[PDB]
Each structure stands twice: as structure tokens, then as C-alpha cells.
């Protein structure tokens, strides 16, 4: 999703509890991984969701999907603001 309307300042609670897994969080927090500024850095590829508990399909690409559509990633194409 190029688009996206988010705040600019988000945890990693606040942030699960808009997509309705912040249930999940735990696992995301004793696995180090809480770091909001990583999301972009680290892998963060389906097997680490699945490491720290989220094994599920609509967790995963969900995760997956909130977590690539962060800022400050690998510029593929077309740059922005």
C-alpha cells in the first residue's frame, strides 16, 4: 500500500490495536522486537511472526504489510516525500 494515513508517532500497543492485534504485542515485546524503528530494518519476514507467535495467515501479511508500508525503507522505484 503506497498510501497510507497514519500517525507519526505510534508504539507498537497503539499500532497492533489499530489492526486488531495488539493481543499479539506480548509476543512482538519479549522478543526484543518492539523497536517501531526497526520494522523497516530488521527482516521481519514470516517465520519472525512466526517465532514469536503470530502463525497465522491474516496476522502474518497483515504484519507484514503495516510494517514494509513504514517509512524509511529501500527505495525501489519513483522517489517521494
Known amino acids: 500500500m503506497i ?3 497514519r500517525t507519526l ?3 507498537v500497543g497503539e499500532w497492533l490495536e489499530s489492526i486488531g492485534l495488539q493481543q499479539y504485542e506480548s509476543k512482538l ?5 518492539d523497536d517501531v524503528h526497526f520494522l ?3 527482516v521481519m519476514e514470516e517465520q519472525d511472526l512466526r517465532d514469536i507467535g503470530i502463525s497465522d ?4 501479511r497483515k504484519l507484514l504489510q503495516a510494517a514494509r508500508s513504514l517509512p524509511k525503507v529501500k ?5 517521494g516525500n
Open 3 to 5: 498510501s497510507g494515513l
Open 9 to 11: 508517532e505510534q508504539s
Open 29 to 33: 515485546l519479549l522478543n526484543g522486537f
Open 40 to 42: 523497516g530494518s530488521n
Open 57 to 60: 495467515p491474516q496476522h502474518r
Open 75 to 79: 527505495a525501489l522505484g519513483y522517489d
